[PDB]
């Protein structure tokens, strides 16, 4: 069950200065980057173009190229359309994609955030506001929904293009998605909380537990998954223990990259 994400972030400083940058993920591996400075989108994998032709892709890019410019002036206008009710600096984010299921089933989304909070989504055949949204946003929504061209285009990308493209992206990048990377573990302690550092493992599902032989230690405190530049995962597990009980306790690791041979390292 994979989730595909296009991520946009635009900042409008004042009435004349702004920028817009984007990035694209399949699950936890990055597929595209589009800088504000760059006139074209970039691939960050060899298989980023999925099963799309060169012509197909170049069409799709040009659409977006136009979009970026349009979108800038539009936000700026929509400010004039509020003011003095609204004011700079303004921060906008959009998250859009489709999440894949068994068979042919998928569900697409387009989610917008104004000034850090989620306010607008595209749903069905038009833009709507979500619960919690400030009322004044109704007027913009009304203008956005006035534009039938845009609506058409957006339904198409969300209904058809996204899934089709991901189904194709999933084939062309299966090697990297199903790639297995073996975790490297080391221990230490700080004034005593003992740490089991795990680093370099892929995919992200992992099982890390402290053991006294076979007694599964319940005082084990798992951290957050942090990334490494080479696109592997780092995690750590801390155990709060009394002085002396260092010798004996060991860290056990379950991962698909090992294949039955569990990492086990003793203090």
């Amino acid at each position, epitope marked *: 069950n994979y989730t595909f994400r296009c991520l946009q972030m635009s900042s409008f400083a004042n009435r004349s200065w702004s920028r817009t940058d984007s990035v694209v993920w399949l699950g936890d591996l990055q597929t595209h980057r589009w800088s504000n400075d760059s006139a074209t989108i970039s691939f960050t994998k060899p298989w980023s173009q999925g099963k799309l032709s060169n012509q197909q892709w170049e069409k799709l890019q040009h659409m977006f190229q136009v979009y970026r410019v349009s979108f800038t002036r539009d936000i700026q206008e929509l400010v004039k359309m509020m*003011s003095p009710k609204e004011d700079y600096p303004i921060e906008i984010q959009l998250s859009a994609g489709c999440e894949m299921y068994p068979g042919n089933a998928s569900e697409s989304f387009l989610h917008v955030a104004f000034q850090g909070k989620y306010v607008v989504r595209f749903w069905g055949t038009s833009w709507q506001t979500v619960p919690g949204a400030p009322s004044w946003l109704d007027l913009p929504i009304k*203008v956005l929904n*006035a*534009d*039938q061209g845009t609506s058409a285009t957006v339904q198409m990308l969300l209904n058809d293009t996204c899934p089709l493209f991901v189904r194709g992206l999933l084939e062309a990048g299966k090697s990297d998605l199903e790639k297995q990377e073996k975790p490297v573990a080391w221990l230490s302690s700080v004034p005593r909380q003992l740490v089991c550092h795990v680093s370099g493992f892929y995919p992200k599902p992992v099982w890390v537990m402290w053991m006294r032989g076979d007694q599964e230690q319940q005082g084990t405190h798992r951290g957050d998954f942090l990334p490494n530049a080479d696109e592997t995962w780092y995690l750590q597990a801390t155990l709060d223990v009394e002085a002396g009980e260092e010798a004996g306790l060991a860290c056990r690791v379950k991962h698909s990259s090992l294949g039955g041979q569990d990492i086990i390292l003793y203090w």
Partner: T-cell receptor
Amino acid sequence: AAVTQSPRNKVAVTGGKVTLSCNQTNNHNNMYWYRQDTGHGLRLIHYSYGAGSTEKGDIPDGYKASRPSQENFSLILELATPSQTSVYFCASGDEGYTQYFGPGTRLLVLE
Amino acid sequence: TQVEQSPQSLVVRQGENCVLQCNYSVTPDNHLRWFKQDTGKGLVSLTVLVDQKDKTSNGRYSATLDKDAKHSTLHITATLLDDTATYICVVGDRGSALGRLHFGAGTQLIVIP
């Protein structure tokens, strides 16, 4: 969808003060001031998204605009010059694209 | 001036047909509209074209739009004396109030009675 202008025709003097006025009873949020000159299409001077707002257009220099209310939009030449001799169109419209144009106002600025 | 009209002006005999041209570079190009303007008078809309390859007709007026070519033509069938007017080409860059209109300077027609 009606748009009216007053006056329809006006003679003024360099350095004088002229007010062109536009009235719309369509409850349109949006109103726009343009000027027509030969060898040119309509160019946008000022526009407004609602009461007590004005926005600079493409050629705003020498004009100032005022939106006292939803129904009225005004173009104000404070220090009239011969170059501001033109025909002025006002229009209005809602969230759609269509703009509805007034009948025009001729202005002549003499020395 | 991303909107260019041609011919600049032309003279025809009543009952003849004529064709007027509009070529533009405006991006994007949501819709294109034709206006008739009588001397001294204001702007009467005649037609508005919206699709990628579009055709409209309104009485003796008919028009085509082709967005790939970014080109439009207005045809007047069986001109009458009242057709003596300037014809103006207008291109709007959005399909909402967020757009700006882009005006050609028009083509001057004189029908000879």
